[PDB]
Design a protein around this ligand. Structure first.
Ligand SMILES: NC(=O)c1ccc[n+]([C@@H]2O[C@H](COP(=O)([O-])OP(=O)(O)OC[C@H]3O[C@@H](n4cnc5c(N)ncnc54)[C@H](O)[C@@H]3O)[C@@H](O)[C@H]2O)c1
Ligand SMILES: NC(=O)c1ccc[n+]([C@@H]2O[C@H](COP(=O)([O-])OP(=O)(O)OC[C@H]3O[C@@H](n4cnc5c(N)ncnc54)[C@H](O)[C@@H]3O)[C@@H](O)[C@H]2O)c1
Ligand SMILES: NC(=O)c1ccc[n+]([C@@H]2O[C@H](COP(=O)([O-])OP(=O)(O)OC[C@H]3O[C@@H](n4cnc5c(N)ncnc54)[C@H](O)[C@@H]3O)[C@@H](O)[C@H]2O)c1
Ligand SMILES: NC(=O)c1ccc[n+]([C@@H]2O[C@H](COP(=O)([O-])OP(=O)(O)OC[C@H]3O[C@@H](n4cnc5c(N)ncnc54)[C@H](O)[C@@H]3O)[C@@H](O)[C@H]2O)c1
Ligand SMILES: O=C(NCc1cn(Cc2ccc(Oc3ccccc3)c(O)c2)nn1)c1cc2ccccc2oc1=O
Ligand SMILES: O=C(NCc1cn(Cc2ccc(Oc3ccccc3)c(O)c2)nn1)c1cc2ccccc2oc1=O
Ligand SMILES: O=C(NCc1cn(Cc2ccc(Oc3ccccc3)c(O)c2)nn1)c1cc2ccccc2oc1=O
Ligand SMILES: O=C(NCc1cn(Cc2ccc(Oc3ccccc3)c(O)c2)nn1)c1cc2ccccc2oc1=O
Ligand code: NA
Ligand code: NA
Ligand code: NA
Ligand code: NA
Ligand code: NA
Lengths: 268, 266, 267, 268
């Protein structure tokens, strides 16, 4: 009956009820999965959000820049799911880039310390989480990360585009490691969705250009997408992540699935 | 069932090893009601499809025959009932004359041979979509079979060119299908022992067929981080069923790789 | 001269706006000795090729005509003199019937029309390489013209499919050409005002031809970091001459984009 | 006469006479270019090596991680070429990755501080040099960087593959900035060449397998390449860089030219 019945899945990246990770968790629970959630920094606020999910799920703290949190993660997950049990899926829905690396801030003015922090959180941490969690994953398992197609340069995304290009490369090497465990590793390249990162990181960096730039982004995406695109609806993206967490894409690994309305395949 | 209540047309069954046979079997296991299409050997195809878990009507369809295409939607509507439409369409059809394959020199394939292969293998994806889109429901899905042609390779020769054209046709079919709320995608599969692999590819390789196919399988399984078994079409069938389902609703004009991850590695 | 001493065959001249006319002009300015091929209206084509800076023999070549292809190497050898070989070949040929283009419905193009377009626009790149590789020197270069078909777009319709096929053919021609020490590559150009743009692409757009080309050009120039001028074929002709030269000796089966960098960007 | 007659070009990345940058400089000088060279750390060795070039060229110190070197670079180059003169070309031929990020060292065991150093030198510095040098470049100018095709994961290249994926993305954004000055930015993806980085960095990280792994790489590359490939010959790569520095690829920017014998377009 449920697409993920009997599956134990770790979902990182919930910060608000608009987070892509919130919708992934909601859809996964609706489909029978038992979740373990991870949150960063504002744990009291995150628990208030995760209480809105269909079912209870333990929340563990994880700052991906914190070596101690990573070294303890597998043990804390095992305590949450019970000794002897393993995870079937892991969702990396994490990203960050300082303001200097985004929007109308000049591309050449982002200092390396800022870009490095963004690449650490947005790309290297996909390898860090796989390293910590592969030893407690079952064969047939699935690791999924979130991508924003960085094949071409574009306005505002700036250094986050470089971090996503690095993340696509990391995913191909993580697939080589995960294959030793019978585990798949893939990214879902989503179209634009109204989340806290889009408003607070992207929107805040666009300044007086946010209104026009985001309208043109939204309109162009919906126009290029042969089936349209609704930036207010994360459900099609959440369903796609759940398809990769399921047993229905068993031969796909080190790859990118586009949940973008088909926009990347069209010029206009 | 993943496809409960869905009405899906599946083309391309010729034997019980056909990729379409496994797609049809998995779709039926998942609750789909099928309409099947077959080319030329209707008596053999009926005997083969009697091995599927459930009954399904078999319609004749030669994609080079304009009359078959012009009458196809009406014949499908008769099989599924007036007022009912399809939710899914699977194109699992290919052909290339021997001159366009194997050890036969690339430059020696005459255009009449290449053209026949492009007609059946690439243009017909647009033909089947033209015939069936008027009888598809919104939220529907059209899926075609691909073999990654982004880089030249031994033996695949002109079939590589037909698949490159098929990928381009798929992106334009997605533009037309979107007007109906329908998705169009290809599944690029790794190598599977089928009649086309043995008769068409192996036939054109001559004395080197066994050795070249062994080298292809071993190399594919090595490159693929999760391995690859050419004797098992089930992972490819499951991937097609995922695209026919409501679980990839935002993917269109695209290519899903069901190849063990081989295309992403060296 | 970049091409001093080189003997190069250039197909595809029909008007003095043809991308092939500008490739031939820049190649002659750079010291190359040319052999030209033309289709159908050879008397008219000779009057156009008389506008080039230097004389060049003009040969008839309809790429759908097996007899023309079978005699081509002998006719080229007669034009350049026995004992000499070609260093370069330029394929700057394309055609698609109206049904396969513009506002005409993508599904209404009959296969006979699409097949004719694929024959002329893609298979012929393999035909010309088959006919001419036997009379090419090591270090030589075959160049074809492409229009980036990696993503679908309005109006280009079935010509996009033909260019996707041409890209795949080019990778296989590189395998054959490598046996002769010859490179094979395509140049994916941005939009240039030529007879095919006006008569074929524009012809199939009905009343929207002007609006569509102006919007295509504006968007292309905006997206291209160095800009794009659709009235100037010289940057494209120079790129083809770079591939015909000895300065890209390790590039084959590939695509070089002379499009202002538009394909690598979004606006 | 010369392909680069009258052009003033800065060339970074010479360490030995096998460096790709040494062959780029030699071919550029044979084609009439006037060079300014930059070197890192081993200036006494670099000066002796550059004395083997066909013509004299000033050598300037440049450590791309040193902010003071980058801030003074344009003034130092202007002093070398004369006030009132500007550069027509810039060649970035710089790369580094700590041993943990390469060879048989496990992908997951490379600490972020090591990956970050490698990404700083190998990818971010392409944007650093463009920021420093664009104010002193003429319209019609050209910036070229060196790439190794990272579109697919492969043995041994490990985190350097991630740095090159990031560099390709950086190049597309440097093209947007360089276009404001009428300057092109592109990468050359070269096949394998026996250089100090190949022997000391890649070979060093392969341990006891260095000889066999490099032999298989060379043999396979030459087999896949329709026109073949010679790892002992950097001249085809140097000529390709000179073609991009010339006026003969005037409409190509934010792009990647493959000087790899055509290997990337084939399977065998
Ligand atoms: N919203 C979009 O349009 C969109 C599109 C494509 C891809 N994505 C990607 O989806 C993912 C989720 O982003 P979102 O849009 O849902 O925004 P969001 O703000 O809801 O989520 C971003 C998450 O990253 C977490 N994070 C930041 N630093 C962290 C750290 N040190 N350790 C652990 N977690 C950390 C934040 O706490 C937050 O939960 C990101 O990878 C983003 O790049 C988003
Ligand atoms: N077998 C593989 O390794 C493999 C891998 C990737 C993709 N594919 C693709 O999968 C598809 C199915 O091939 P397969 O391997 O299952 O082989 P198969 O021989 O089982 O199927 C090929 C089918 O094409 C049909 N066909 C041929 N001419 C036709 C026509 N005129 N009208 C209608 N149908 C026609 C045949 O009747 C047959 O059913 C093809 O598109 C093939 O290129 C196969
Ligand atoms: N104009 C553009 O914007 C543009 C952009 C990118 C690529 N291209 C490509 O450049 C090439 C040249 O086109 P153009 O734009 O210069 O237009 P054009 O009309 O000047 O040239 C097209 C040429 O194809 C020739 N041709 C047609 N059928 C032929 C046949 N049977 N045999 C031999 N030659 C035949 C015509 O005679 C003509 O010389 C084509 O491949 C085209 O697709 C054009
Ligand atoms: N050798 C190959 O097979 C090959 C193939 C493709 C691409 N490449 C690329 O070509 C470029 C040149 O490498 P190579 O193979 O000639 O090796 P090399 O060892 O000759 O050159 C590497 C250079 O990087 C310089 N460098 C390192 N850290 C630096 C810093 N902090 N500041 C400034 N310069 C610094 C070194 O001083 C050296 O000159 C690199 O980007 C490399 O990745 C090499
Ligand atoms: O990327 C663009 N603008 C910025 C942008 C991207 N997005 C989507 C998104 C939101 C939040 C994300 O999460 C994050 C987390 C942490 C840190 C930074 C982002 C994220 O990864 C992606 N929303 N706004 C544009 C692209 C574009 C493409 C085609 C044509 C025109 C275009 O115009 C644009 O403005
Ligand atoms: O493609 C290759 N060889 C030929 C080949 C392809 N296949 C898979 C297949 C079977 C039948 C197919 O169906 C059809 C139907 C109708 C008409 C032609 C084929 C089909 O499309 C694809 N099996 N053998 C090779 C690729 C390769 C890649 C990497 C390294 C080495 C390689 O070596 C190869 O030999
Ligand atoms: O009208 C459009 N596209 C059609 C097109 C293509 N070209 C360039 C070209 C010319 C002649 C060619 O030569 C040939 C020769 C023989 C046979 C067909 C074409 C050729 O290959 C390519 N010019 N117009 C578009 C309108 C648009 C408006 C706004 C934003 C984006 C857009 O994108 C479009 O692509
Ligand atoms: O990448 C590979 N091995 C490692 C490798 C790469 N290269 C070429 C190179 C040398 C030095 C470089 O400069 C640098 C500078 C600073 C820091 C690291 C490297 C560089 O960027 C690239 N030589 N050995 C392989 C690729 C591969 C592809 C197809 C089939 C099999 C394969 O097997 C391989 O072993
Ligand atoms: Na749309
Ligand atoms: Na494997
Ligand atoms: Na569906
Ligand atoms: Na522009
Ligand atoms: Na070779």
């Amino acid at each position: 009956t449920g697409l993920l019945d009997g599956k134990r899945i770790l979902v990182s990246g919930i910060i608000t009820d608009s987070s892509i990770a919130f919708h992934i968790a909601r859809v996964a629970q609706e489909q029978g999965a038992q979740l373990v959630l991870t949150g960063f920094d504002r744990l009291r606020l995150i628990q208030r959000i995760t209480d809105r999910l269909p079912a209870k799920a333990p929340l563990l703290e994880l700052d991906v820049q914190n070596e101690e949190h990573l070294a303890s993660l597998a043990g804390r997950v095992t305590e949450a799911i019970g000794a002897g049990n393993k995870l079937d899926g892991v969702v990396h829905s994490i990203g960050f880039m300082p303001q200097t690396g985004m929007g109308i801030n000049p591309f050449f003015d982002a200092p390396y310390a800022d870009v490095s922090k963004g690449i650490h959180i947005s790309a290297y941490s996909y390898a860090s989480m796989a390293k910590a969690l592969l030893p407690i994953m079952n064969p047939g398992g699935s690791i999924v990360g979130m991508d924003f197609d960085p094949s071409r340069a574009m306005p505002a995304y700036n250094w986050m585009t470089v971090a996503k290009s690095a993340l696509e490369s990391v995913n191909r090497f993580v697939a080589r490691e995960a294959g030793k465990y019978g585990v798949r590793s893939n990214l879902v390249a989503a179209g634009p969705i109204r989340t806290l990162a889009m408003s607070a990181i992207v929107g805040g960096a666009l300044g007086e250009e946010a209104g026009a730039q985001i309208q043109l982004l939204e309109e162009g995406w919906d126009q290029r997408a042969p089936i349209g695109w609704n930036m207010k609806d994360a459900t099609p993206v959440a369903k796609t992540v759940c398809a990769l967490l399921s047993d229905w894409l068993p031969a796909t690994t080190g790859d990118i699935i586009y949940a973008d309305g088909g926009a990347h395949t069209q010029l206009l």
